[PDB]
């Protein structure tokens, strides 16, 4: 109901090809052309040279299973630094005497 629009949204891309698998918690923004075989590429598209970034087709008419989902992943890591963020507290009534 938000991202998908009539005509398609090409702003959101993804990396289809990479020479290997990414390590945990690694972000690679490199646009370098992926080389499948031994044929030289040099940034020019051609035989065995493919542009890794591909587009997500976004329209409201697509089926429910393939509809885009906005995913928010929270990374919980406990280091040796002093702890700050904590859960919400609860305040009760005050009585005297």
């Amino acid at each position: 109901n938000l991202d998908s629009k009539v005509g398609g949204n090409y702003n959101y891309l993804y990396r289809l090809f990479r020479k290997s698998n990414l390590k945990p918690f690694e972000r690679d923004i490199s646009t370098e052309i992926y080389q499948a075989g031994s044929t030289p590429c040099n940034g020019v598209k051609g035989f065995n040279c493919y542009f890794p970034l591909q587009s997500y087709g976004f329209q409201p008419t697509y089926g429910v299973g393939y509809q885009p989902y906005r995913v928010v992943v929270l990374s919980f890591e406990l280091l040796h630094a002093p702890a700050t963020v904590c859960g919400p507290k609860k305040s009760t009534n005050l009585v005297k005497n």
């Binding site: 289809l16 499948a36 031994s38 591909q54 089926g63 393939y66």
Partner: protein
């Protein structure tokens, strides 16, 4: 470093790009079919040419990956369709003239009409105009005027266009290393790469000929039954050992005999099963027709329909302002977008059609997890066959009494079921010899065994032998019967209709044995039975990614087509037709002619 790594990389990227453009190409055709506008007619041609030229550009890089170095079966099947260059193998002159002949023959078929001999001012087009009149017309001359005069300005006019259609399509198969163009359509059943399941292309010629031999004793008894009812009308032109006229088959080309079911009713003193008058009292609309059919797929274990399917359905035609084609069709766009364009009225046929139209969508849901190249039926006959077995279980009296259409006190006996089996036989039995006749004729002409002068000489000669139909007026080589046909002129597969009958009855017998149904096969109902839906779901998700001979064994246990389910399902009717034909002659002769005495 290996070619398999380079071929798989090409296929991984191609599946994404080909799926994006095919969705926009199918969406442009959807907006054009549902709404006639000047913007949609241009979008269909623009999006259609972008997807058509996309396969031509990717075919250049597809031929650079030989299949000899690929040991994977799924990779070679995805590259099997991309290896073909299509029309690029033809010369620049023959490639441009090929689309011209296809568009010209399609335009003449749409713009063709026969003016009334009695009313020269009024001129009616073939569809719907002439196809509707030929259905209910009982006259001898009125049917002959529309049947004979059509091929005069069409069959004779399309002959030079058909001669060029044969020459252009033969040069494409020769560049593709095919024996002829008749072998091109037989390449859909081709199976290679698996030990023991290999299926040769030339094997289909022997298969359709051998399976048709066991069809003859069932067809001869039905052909004599129809001839006995129409014998009293014209005893001079209709011989007991002769053949039936061509124009009296119930329509133009004699594809279906259902139009003759009115006069062929064995018992007219008993009611017939009809849900039309039942749905009127229940007050049902087009919204609940698809809803009741969706619960049929849930009872067998198959998944339901997505919310976007029922919301985007087109339930009617809003007048002439926005016009849509009422021909029922199931359109599969992609990425989970499923839509059906049909004009839904309240009739008994629309109820069975709803199970057929939703059968294609339910069939597409199983293999939808496959790549774009692997999304398809295992052959051309499995597309429509899956939707038919869904409608066969709905037409049974058991399923109609479940939801409340038919009264539970309705008497079901031999007299009621024989009347029902005859209506299906006119559509089923009558189609097989006509489909085997015209398809074998195309294979012989495309091969070169029949000279151009003998086209019509062998057409009617082999027609009395197969379907037992003789022409009232003899025709010369100028006329062409297949040129006027919808499928031949539009270059669509005509063989898918013959094999469909054999594939749908095999599945009908196998699913009823899994659910432990007893009695005759036409009494079987697959509703509420989840055991048969699980065995079928395994094959439905395979598609063409696996050999159709292997996927067929996982259901019926057979490696090829078999006539045994065809005989058993029609066995109650075959026993009744044999007793009624004792007073007549079973079979026909090819030496009888209406103009030769």
């Amino acid at each position: 470093s290996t070619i398999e790594e380079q071929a798989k990389t090409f296929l991984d990227k191609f599946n994404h790009e080909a799926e994006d453009l095919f969705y926009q190409s199918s969406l442009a055709s959807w907006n054009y079919n549902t709404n006639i506008t000047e913007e949609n007619v241009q979008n269909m041609n623009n999006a259609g040419d972008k997807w058509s030229a996309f396969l031509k550009e990717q075919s250049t890089l597809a031929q650079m990956y030989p299949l000899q170095e690929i040991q994977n079966l799924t990779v070679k099947l995805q590259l099997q369709a991309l290896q073909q260059n299509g029309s690029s193998v033809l010369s620049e002159d023959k490639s441009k003239r090929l689309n011209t002949i296809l568009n010209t023959m399609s335009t003449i078929y749409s713009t063709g009409k026969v003016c009334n001999p009695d009313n020269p001012q009024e001129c009616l087009l073939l569809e719907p105009g002439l196809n509707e009149i030929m259905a209910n017309s009982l006259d001898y001359n009125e049917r002959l005027w529309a049947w004979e005069s059509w091929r005069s300005e069409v069959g004779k006019q399309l002959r030079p266009l058909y001669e060029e259609y044969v020459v252009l399509k033969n040069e494409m198969a020769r560049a593709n290393h095919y024996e002829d163009y008749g072998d091109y359509w037989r390449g859909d059943y081709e199976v290679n790469g698996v030990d023991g399941y290999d299926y040769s292309r030339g094997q289909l010629i022997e298969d359709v000929e051998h399976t048709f031999e066991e069809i003859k004793p069932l067809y001869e008894h039905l052909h004599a039954y129809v001839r006995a009812k129409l014998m009293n009308a014209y005893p001079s032109y209709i011989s007991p050992i002769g053949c039936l006229p061509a124009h009296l088959l119930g329509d133009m080309w004699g594809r279906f005999w259902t139009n003759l079911y009115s006069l062929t009713v064995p018992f007219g003193q008993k009611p017939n099963i009809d849900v039309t008058d039942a749905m009127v009292d229940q007050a049902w609309d087009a919204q609940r027709i698809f809803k009741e059919a969706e619960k049929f797929f849930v009872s067998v274990g198959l998944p339901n329909m997505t919310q976007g399917f029922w919301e985007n359905s087109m339930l009617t035609d809003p007048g002439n302002v926005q016009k849509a084609v009422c021909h029922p069709t199931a359109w599969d766009l992609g990425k989970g977008d499923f839509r059906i364009l049909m004009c839904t009225k309240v009739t008994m046929d629309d109820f069975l059609t709803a199970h057929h139209e939703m059968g294609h969508i339910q069939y597409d849901m199983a293999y939808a997890a496959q790549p774009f190249l692997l999304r398809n039926g295992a052959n051309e006959g499995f597309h429509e066959a899956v939707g038919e077995i869904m409608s066969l279980s709905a037409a049974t009296p058991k399923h109609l009494k479940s939801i409340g259409l038919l009264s539970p006190d309705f008497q079901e006996d031999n007299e009621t079921e024989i009347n029902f089996l005859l209506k299906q036989a006119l559509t089923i039995v009558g189609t097989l010899p006509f489909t085997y006749m015209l398809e074998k004729w195309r294979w012989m002409v495309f091969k070169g065994e029949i000279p151009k002068d003998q086209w019509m000489k062998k057409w009617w000669e082999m027609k009395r032998e197969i379907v037992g139909v003789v022409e009232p007026v003899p025709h010369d080589e100028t006329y062409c019967d297949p040129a006027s046909l919808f499928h031949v002129s539009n270059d669509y597969s005509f063989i898918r209709y013959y094999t469909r009958t054999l594939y749908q009855f095999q599945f009908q017998e196998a699913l009823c044995q899994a659910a432990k149904h007893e009695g005759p096969l036409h009494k079987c109902d697959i509703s509420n039975s989840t055991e048969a839906g699980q065995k079928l779901f395994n094959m439905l998700r395979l598609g063409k990614s696996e050999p159709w001979t292997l996927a067929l064994e996982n259901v019926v246990g057979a490696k090829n087509m078999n006539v045994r389910p065809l005989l058993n399902y029609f066995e109650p009717l075959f026993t009744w037709l044999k007793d009624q034909n004792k007073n007549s002659f079973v079979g026909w002769s090819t030496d009888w002619s209406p103009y030769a005495d």
